[PDB]
Amino acid sequence: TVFRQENVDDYYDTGEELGSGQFAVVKKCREKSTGLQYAAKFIKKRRTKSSRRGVSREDIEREVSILKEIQHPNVITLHEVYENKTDVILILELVAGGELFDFLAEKESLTEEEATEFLKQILNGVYYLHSLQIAHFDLKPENIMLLDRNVPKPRIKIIDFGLAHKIDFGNEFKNIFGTPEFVAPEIVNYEPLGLEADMWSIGVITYILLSGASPFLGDTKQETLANVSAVNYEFEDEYFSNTSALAKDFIRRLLVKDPKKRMTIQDSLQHPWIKP
Numbered sequence: 131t132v133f134r135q136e137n138v139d140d141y142y143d144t145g146e147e148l149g150s151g152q153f154a155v156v157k158k159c160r161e162k163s164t165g166l167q168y169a170a171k172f173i174k175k176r177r178t179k180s181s182r183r184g185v186s187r188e189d190i191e192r193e194v195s196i197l198k199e200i201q202h203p204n205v206i207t208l209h210e211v212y213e214n215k216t217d218v219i220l221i222l223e224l225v226a227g228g229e230l231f232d233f234l235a236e237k238e239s240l241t242e243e244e245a246t247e248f249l250k251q252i253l254n255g256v257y258y259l260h261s262l263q264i265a266h267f268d269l270k271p272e273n274i275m276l277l278d279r280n281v282p283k284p285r286i287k288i289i290d291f292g293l294a295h296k297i298d299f300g301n302e303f304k305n306i307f308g309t310p311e312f313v314a315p316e317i318v319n320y321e322p323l324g325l326e327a328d329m330w331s332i333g334v335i336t337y338i339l340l341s342g343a344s345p346f347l348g349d350t351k352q353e354t355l356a357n358v359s360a361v362n363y364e365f366e367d368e369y370f371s372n373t374s375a376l377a378k379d380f381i382r383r384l385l386v387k388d389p390k391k392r393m394t395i396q397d398s399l400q401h402p403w404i405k406p
């Protein structure tokens with residue numbers, strides 16, 4: 131599939147940087163014709179078929195294909211796509227309230243109600259995606275963005291569909307691997323992956339939201355991965371002494387090694403800690 135090849139600078143003005151990764155940079159921008167603001171994600175293309183730098187066209191097209199399908203209050207949307215010889219440029223919905231990661235760093239830990247306020251929105255977004263057979267595969271606080279961080283109950287949007295895949299056969303078996311602290315055991319063990327991997331990630335996020343601590347984090351990535359595979363985590367009393375047993379139950383039912391025994395997104399929404 132080909133994208134718009136006019137110079138993006140002819141239609142948009144760019145401003146402050148909103149993100150920077152291994153193969154992508156995000157800049158705030160403004161569409162000249164409407165005055166509306168967006169986030170322009172510049173994804174570096176591969177310069178040769180055997181290169182390890184840049185993102186393959188197949189991977190870029192997959193991300194775009196998934197983004198084009200989604201429209202939900204808790205997921206980022208795609209406005210337009212441009213490309214040139216060096217980059218594919220996604221013009222995405224602007225989410226200007228910063229990462230959930232940074233908001234958490236500025237509060238240490240959340241109350242259960244604050245945590246469930248965020249978590250219910252994450253679950254709603256993932257319910258939508260999973261309903262579409264879309265596995266995100268990179269859920270973590272850095273990939274949750276607030277619309278406005280200066281309100282009592284911030285609204286959030288899931289971003290960064292760079293690892294997302296359609297699961298039309300129940301599982302996929304490709305080169306997929308996210309951030310060690312948040313990946314499920316099946317990712318660590320290079321097993322077939324499905325929608326269940328995201329539910330594990332939600333369990334990790336929930337643990338962090340309630341404690342300010344990462345459940346499997348080791349001193350090295352390899353140690354973290356080993357901890358994940360062994361399900362080596364516990365609820366430290368210092369952090370969870372006044373956390374409800376039902377909150378712990380929710381987490382426990384997500385941080386399950388066997389993906390078939392892990393709570394599904396529908397299960398999570400009916401769990402007594404979440405269900406209204």
Ligand SMILES: c1cc(-c2ccnnc2)ccn1
Pocket residue numbers: 148149150156169171206222223224225226275289290
């Ligand atoms: C603000 C920032 C972003 C963002 C930041 C970092 N990585 N991907 C998207 C997307 C939308 N709005």
Ligand SMILES: [Cl-]
Pocket residue numbers: 171206222289290291
């Ligand atoms: Cl994004």
